[PDB]
Amino acid sequence: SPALPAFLLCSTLLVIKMYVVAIITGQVRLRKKAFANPEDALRHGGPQYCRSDPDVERCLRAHRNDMETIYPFLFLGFVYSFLGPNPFVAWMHFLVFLVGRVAHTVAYLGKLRAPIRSVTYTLAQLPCASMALQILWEAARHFLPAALRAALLGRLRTLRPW
Amino acid sequence: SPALPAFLLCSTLLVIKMYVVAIITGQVRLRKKAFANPEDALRHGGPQYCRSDPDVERCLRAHRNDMETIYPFLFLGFVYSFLGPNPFVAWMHFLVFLVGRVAHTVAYLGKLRAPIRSVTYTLAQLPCASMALQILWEAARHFLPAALRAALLGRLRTLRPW
Amino acid sequence: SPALPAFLLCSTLLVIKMYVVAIITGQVRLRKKAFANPEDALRHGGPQYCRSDPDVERCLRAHRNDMETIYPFLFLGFVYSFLGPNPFVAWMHFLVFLVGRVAHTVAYLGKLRAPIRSVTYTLAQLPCASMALQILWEAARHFLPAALRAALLGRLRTLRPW
Numbered sequence: 001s002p003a004l005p006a007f008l009l010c011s012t013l014l015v016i017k018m019y020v021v022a023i024i025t026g027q028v029r030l031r032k033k034a035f036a037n038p039e040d041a042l043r044h045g046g047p048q049y050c051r052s053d054p055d056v057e058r059c060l061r062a063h064r065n066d067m068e069t070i071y072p073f074l075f076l077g078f079v080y081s082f083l084g085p086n087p088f089v090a091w092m093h094f095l096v097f098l099v100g101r102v103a104h105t106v107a108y109l110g111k112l113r114a115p116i117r118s119v120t121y122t123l124a125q126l127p128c129a130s131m132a133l134q135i136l137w138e139a140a141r142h143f144l145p146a147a148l149r150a151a152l153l154g155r156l157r158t159l160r161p162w
Numbered sequence: 163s164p165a166l167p168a169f170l171l172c173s174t175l176l177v178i179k180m181y182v183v184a185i186i187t188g189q190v191r192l193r194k195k196a197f198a199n200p201e202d203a204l205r206h207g208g209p210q211y212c213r214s215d216p217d218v219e220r221c222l223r224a225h226r227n228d229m230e231t232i233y234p235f236l237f238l239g240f241v242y243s244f245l246g247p248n249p250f251v252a253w254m255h256f257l258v259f260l261v262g263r264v265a266h267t268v269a270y271l272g273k274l275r276a277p278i279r280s281v282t283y284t285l286a287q288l289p290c291a292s293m294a295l296q297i298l299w300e301a302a303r304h305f306l307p308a309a310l311r312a313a314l315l316g317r318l319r320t321l322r323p324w
Numbered sequence: 325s326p327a328l329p330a331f332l333l334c335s336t337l338l339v340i341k342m343y344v345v346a347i348i349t350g351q352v353r354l355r356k357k358a359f360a361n362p363e364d365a366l367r368h369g370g371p372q373y374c375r376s377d378p379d380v381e382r383c384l385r386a387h388r389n390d391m392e393t394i395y396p397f398l399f400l401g402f403v404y405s406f407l408g409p410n411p412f413v414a415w416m417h418f419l420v421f422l423v424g425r426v427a428h429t430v431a432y433l434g435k436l437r438a439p440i441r442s443v444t445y446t447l448a449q450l451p452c453a454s455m456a457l458q459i460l461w462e463a464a465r466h467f468l469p470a471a472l473r474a475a476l477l478g479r480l481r482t483l484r485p486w
């Protein structure tokens with residue numbers, strides 16, 4: 001599986017990107033003094049700092065969207081890697097998703113004008129959709145009747161008693 | 163692993179179901195004009211459309227619940243597939259989860275009367291619980307003392323010097 | 325892969341811990357009468373019980389944080405298990421993460437003083453960071469030029485025509 005080290009490379013960089021979003025979220029909490037729990041708020045000034053902030057909420061939205069997209073990629077991309085796809089095609093799938101998700105986070109936390117973020121979401125979802133369809137294709141043909149699968153390989157049953 | 167193509171089939175259909183929930187979420191945002199970000203709201207009418215909506219929140223809750231349930235299934239079901247279970251039993255696990263989760267989303271976005279949704283949640287969780295216990299069983303017996311594992315296979319140590 | 329049954333053991337216990345958080349969340353909803361959906365609220369007293377509660381929100385935050393941390397562990401830990409690491413070192417990674425995450429949930433739902441929870445988060449993230457770096461290391465060296473990889477193995481090219 002020559003696509004596997006490519007997948008492990010892109011997938012792990014994405015998980016690390018998610019860890020970075022988490023770190024950013026914490027730092028925004030500190031600087032804005034907006035904590036989710038009263039116990040946190042006491043340690044950093046007092047009870048009034050148990051409150052929401054637009055930037056914290058934005059960070060949480062970016063993190064959630066990552067979870068809604070990157071996690072299924074971790075699954076789909078892994079399985080797809082064992083379907084023996086064209087190595088260059090596989091790279092393209094992984095790279096489009098990686099560039100797209102990084103761009104998504106930049107457009108989100110950077111508050112770029114609409115619909116830039118929405119576009120990056122859709123573009124990144126394209127290779128995921130492709131991998132899902134390809135996996136479904138391979139799983140489905142497993143359950144095709146043996147006679148049909150034989151015919152698709154140019155083999156019809158023989159009436160010759162041999 | 164004859165259960166594997168069954169698993170890949172159900173698991174991928176579930177990921178696609180999650181993508182559909184995402185799409186529905188976006189469409190509800192458009193129609194209700196309820197955006198999470200001010201930049202989105204400007205592009206689609208103005209700042210007043212940066213607001214929440216009960217349907218958007220409902221969609222987000224359905225998506226989160228999917229994430230809380232389908233993602234561990236992707237993990238448990240995969241590992242379970244390599245434990246060589248009875249193929250029919252494996253199918254049943256995958257199918258109960260698939261039917262249950264689809265039903266869960268229908269009951270959620272369709273606002274059916276309580277406790278229909280809650281019931282579908284519990285029913286779908288049953289095969290997950292079963293797979294988790296079975297995996298734990300197999301992992302645990304790996305760490306059993308060699309003498310005990312031998313005895314469970316009908317082999318006691320021999321005092322005969324051979 | 326001697327680390328694998330160790331991983332499957334810790335990982336599955338963590339998924340079960342997440343299921344328990346879900347169960348706790350439901351019970352807190354019942355006792356506090358704080359439901360997210362109006363249909364649920366009707367079944368359990370009436371429309372006024374469609375409301376938020378600090379404990380429910382806290383439970384949801386704990387569950388989300390689990391999702392932000394345990395899910396990438398399920399991925400990283402699995403891949404790491406096939407990198408043939410030292411069995412004792414692998415155990416340590418899995419055990420630090422398991423103890424840390426359990427401690428995180430206890431500190432969260434138990435409302436312990438800050439920064440206890442935040443500390444357990446960081447400690448648990450340490451083995452994840454280590455596994456991610458190690459995976460990246462192995463993936464990266466796959467794409468090193470063949471000549472460099474040979475040299476790192478003590479093999480320079482030979483000018484002798486043999």
Ligand SMILES: Cn1c(Nc2c(Cl)ccc(CNC(=O)C(C)(C)C)c2Cl)nc2cc(C(=O)NCC(F)(F)F)c(OCC(C)(C)O)cc21
Pocket residue numbers: 022023025026027029030035039040041043438439442443444445446447
């Ligand atoms: C006051 N405090 C906080 N406060 C806090 C609270 Cl109460 C709530 C929310 C945040 C924001 N979180 C963040 O910024 C993260 C880096 C944890 C993601 C923070 Cl930073 N987090 C800490 C985190 C740590 C921490 O993780 N230290 C490193 C260790 F865990 F390995 F010990 C810490 O250790 C200091 C010392 C002396 C114990 O080493 C202190 C900490």
Ligand SMILES: Cn1c(Nc2c(Cl)ccc(CNC(=O)C(C)(C)C)c2Cl)nc2cc(C(=O)NCC(F)(F)F)c(OCC(C)(C)O)cc21
Pocket residue numbers: 114115118119120121122123184185187188189191192197201202203205
């Ligand atoms: C105005 N707009 C939006 N608006 C928007 C905003 Cl600002 C915020 C929230 C939503 C709701 N999201 C959705 O409905 C999704 C389908 C993206 C899930 C939407 Cl639809 N999303 C777009 C998304 C796209 C889009 O993804 N186009 C296809 C492409 F990405 F491949 F180019 C787009 O492309 C139009 C054009 C001319 C650039 O092709 C325009 C778009």
Ligand SMILES: Cn1c(Nc2c(Cl)ccc(CNC(=O)C(C)(C)C)c2Cl)nc2cc(C(=O)NCC(F)(F)F)c(OCC(C)(C)O)cc21
Pocket residue numbers: 276277280281282283284285346347349350351353354359363364365367
């Ligand atoms: C009234 N009710 C609710 N209410 C409810 C509602 Cl409407 C909203 C939120 C919660 C909190 N959820 C929880 O506590 C969970 C255990 C589901 C996580 C609950 Cl408990 N959930 C049920 C859940 C079930 C349930 O899951 N029963 C077991 C079965 F599904 F296998 F049938 C149920 O079955 C009773 C009967 C007679 C149908 O067996 C009734 C239920």
Ligand SMILES: N[C@@H](CCC(=O)N[C@@H](CS)C(=O)NCC(=O)O)C(=O)O
Pocket residue numbers: 061062064065068117118119121122184185187188198222225
């Ligand atoms: N949970 C998403 C579902 C649709 C989606 O993923 N939309 C993309 C493109 S508009 C996005 O960036 N959503 C922002 C978000 O999830 O906060 C939402 O509420 O919008």
Ligand SMILES: N[C@@H](CCC(=O)N[C@@H](CS)C(=O)NCC(=O)O)C(=O)O
Pocket residue numbers: 223224226227230279280281283284346347349350360384387
């Ligand atoms: N996060 C869940 C934990 C319990 C759970 O999963 N409940 C099921 C059956 S009541 C459900 O459908 N919850 C709706 C949801 O998560 O919005 C919650 O807040 O209720």
Ligand SMILES: N[C@@H](CCC(=O)N[C@@H](CS)C(=O)NCC(=O)O)C(=O)O
Pocket residue numbers: 022023025026036060063385386388389392441442443445446
């Ligand atoms: N989503 C997290 C990102 C940072 C994080 O994971 N922080 C740890 C240590 S402070 C935590 O326990 N956060 C609580 C939470 O996610 O509710 C947040 O909003 O704080």
